[PDB]
From Swiss-Prot:
GO terms, molecular function: 4 iron, 4 sulfur cluster binding; heme binding; metal ion binding; NADP binding; sulfite reductase (NADPH) activity
Function: Component of the sulfite reductase complex that catalyzes the 6-electron reduction of sulfite to sulfide. This is one of several activities required for the biosynthesis of L-cysteine from sulfate.
Sequence positions that bind siroheme: 378
Organism, scientific name: Escherichia coli (strain K12)
Entry annotated with the keyword Membrane: no
Binding of [4Fe-4S] cluster, residues: 329, 335, 374, 378
Database matches in NCBIfam families: CysI (TIGR02041), PRK13504.1 (NF010029)
Family: Belongs to the nitrite and sulfite reductase 4Fe-4S domain family.
Protein name as annotated: Sulfite reductase [NADPH] hemoprotein beta-component
Pathway given in the UniProt record: Sulfur metabolism; hydrogen sulfide biosynthesis; hydrogen sulfide from sulfite (NADPH route): step 1/1
Keywords annotated in UniProt: 4Fe-4S, Amino-acid biosynthesis, Cysteine biosynthesis, Heme, Iron, Iron-sulfur, Metal-binding, NADP, Oxidoreductase
């Protein structure tokens, strides 16, 4: 009553798309395709009499499922829509090679990997065990900076667990990629706590043995030494909504899809619309880490046709920049672990945020805002500027003071409060931000500067008050 696909970098062909669309419509309870924030999709509610057919369905189109509940390598992410458009094909092959390499290894806990192309951190690297930050010379990849040990999951009240950002190890030439990957996984495989699984994650291993220790083991195993980190900088995590020009006669249309939930709604047939686009589209689709969908590699001759369908089906309905940069995990009704609503709470909650933004003259700005149903953190609220972590039905821990690019964990500001309390708080603070902020200053960075909340400087030690 949940299936997830292995889909490195979120790249899926249109022939594949027609297959999963058919199956979701006819052989699941919910009848939907659910885009995940790890660039793949899920079915919800598969009857046991259809579990066999679904793997047969995937295989017939060259796809394969991920086992959700094993301690394995999860979907490998890859920046979906790089500003340097040409870089994508390469980055993607490496995401694919790494994904295949790490197939059956057998770990203390699930292992999470990304290929990142600056200046975008859409894939949200600091949530991940192992990150390859691409370095390019003249439109060709030369190497990667390696960042190890991100992970967001916590347990309420439990100061022995914590979200942690990933750590810089150094730079490696393209050619050692697979040896470094394997070195990191096997090092974690060997040193990771196998008794307590809420302490097995790489982030805990690193804090137990030290960064330098873990890094030296990896050099030893990979047969290399790391060079110093090479320059890179991030400007955002958002998707690029609408048309963007690729290379040559190539255009990408990124469709905003609230909670990545693909279904036919009243006056908005999202599912039927994407099926029809899939039927005529020359290239393929890309599932983003923001739970959106890119119709990729559209020739300029084909733009009006594609856009007519998307438009008619409600796929291109204008939403605020605030809504484009908000996210929620699945939670109820399907998640057995859910504490508070997340996906089903987000749309109305953001309507209220939209009103507050408008109330303060900042309807054109945005705050990276995320809701997660429980402290497992799937919604990545623990890298948000404003994070809501579900604690019970209708109640959330409110976190403040991450930043736009997702390199700082937000500290808990208020605990176990309800939506009206949350809104009243944010009304106050957004008002202060609108009036007192320096030019271009983000809301997260502001709360910190103005002493509204203390920054989280050393997660393992100062996350918890
Ligand atoms: C769909 C998704 C959220 C979303 O709306 O997109 C999701 C959904 C669930 N996550 Fe997740 N996680 C999703 C990204 C994440 C990420 C964010 C990321 O990877 O970018 C995290 C936080 C980062 C991290 O790993 O720390 C995350 C941390 C977890 C955890 C906590 C793991 C831990 O280290 O403690 C669990 C529970 C567990 O396994 O212990 C979990 C468990 C779950 C399960 C499978 C619940 C379960 O174990 O029974 C969820 C299924 C709910 C449902 O019915 O659909 N999910 N989950 C993401 C699917 C990812 C994918 O395609 O493979
Ligand atoms: S965060 Fe907690 S609630 Fe939201 S999906 Fe992941 S597990 Fe279910
Ligand atoms: K952005
Ligand atoms: K989305």
């Amino acid at each position: 009553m949940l299936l997830r696909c292995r889909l490195p970098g979120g790249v899926i062909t249109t022939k594949q798309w027609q297959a999963i669309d058919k199956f979701a419509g006819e052989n699941t309870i919910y009848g939907s395709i659910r885009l995940t924030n790890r660039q793949t999709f899920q079915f919800h509610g598969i009857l046991k009499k259809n579990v066999k057919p679904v793997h047969q369905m995937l295989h017939s189109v060259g796809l394969d499922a991920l086992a959700t509940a094993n301690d394995m390598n999860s979907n490998v992410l890859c920046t979906s829509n790089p500003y340097e458009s040409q870089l994508h094909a390469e980055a993607y092959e490496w995401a694919k090679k790494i994904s295949e390499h790490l197939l059956p290894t057998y770990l203390p806990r699930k292992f999470k990997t990304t290929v990142v192309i600056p200046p975008q951190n859409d894939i949200d690297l600091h949530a991940n065990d192992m990150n390859f930050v691409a370095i390019a010379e003249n439109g060709k990849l030369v190497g990667f900076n390696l960042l190890v040990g991100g992970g967001l999951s916590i347990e309420h009240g439990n100061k022995k667990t914590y979200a942690r950002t990933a750590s810089e190890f150094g730079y490696l030439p393209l050619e050692h990629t697979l040896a470094v990957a394997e070195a990191v996984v096997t090092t974690q495989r060997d040193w990771g706590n196998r008794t307590d699984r809420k302490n097995a994650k790489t982030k805990y291993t690193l804090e137990r043995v030290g960064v330098e220790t873990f890094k030296a083991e990896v050099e030893r195993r990979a047969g290399i030494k790391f060079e110093p980190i090479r320059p890179y900088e991030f400007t955002g995590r958002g998707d690029r909504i609408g048309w963007v020009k690729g290379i040559d006669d190539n255009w990408h249309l990124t469709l905003f899809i609230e909670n990545g939930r693909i279904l036919d709604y009243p006056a908005r047939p999202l599912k039927t619309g994407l099926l029809e686009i899939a039927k005529i589209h020359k290239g393929d689709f890309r599932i983003t880490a923001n739970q959106n969908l890119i119709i990729a590699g559209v020739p300029e001759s084909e733009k009006a046709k594609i856009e007519k369908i998307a438009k008619e089906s409600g796929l291109m309905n204008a939403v605020t920049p605030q809504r484009e940069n908000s996210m929620a995990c699945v939670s109820f009704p399907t998640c057995p672990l859910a504490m508070a609503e997340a996906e089903r709470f987000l749309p109305s909650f953001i309507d209220n945020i939209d009103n507050l933004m408008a109330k303060h003259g900042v309807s054109d700005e945005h705050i990276v805002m995320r809701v997660t149903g429980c402290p497992n953190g799937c919604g990545r609220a623990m890298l948000a500027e404003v994070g809501l972590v579900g604690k019970a039905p209708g109640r959330y821990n409110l976190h403040l003071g991450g930043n736009r690019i997702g390199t700082r964990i937000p500290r808990m500001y208020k605990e176990n409060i309800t939506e009206p309390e949350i809104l009243a708080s944010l009304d106050e603070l957004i008002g202060r931000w609108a009036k007192e902020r320096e030019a271009g200053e983000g809301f997260g960075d502001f709360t910190v500067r103005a002493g509204i909340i203390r920054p989280v400087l050393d997660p393992a030690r100062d996350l918890w008050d």
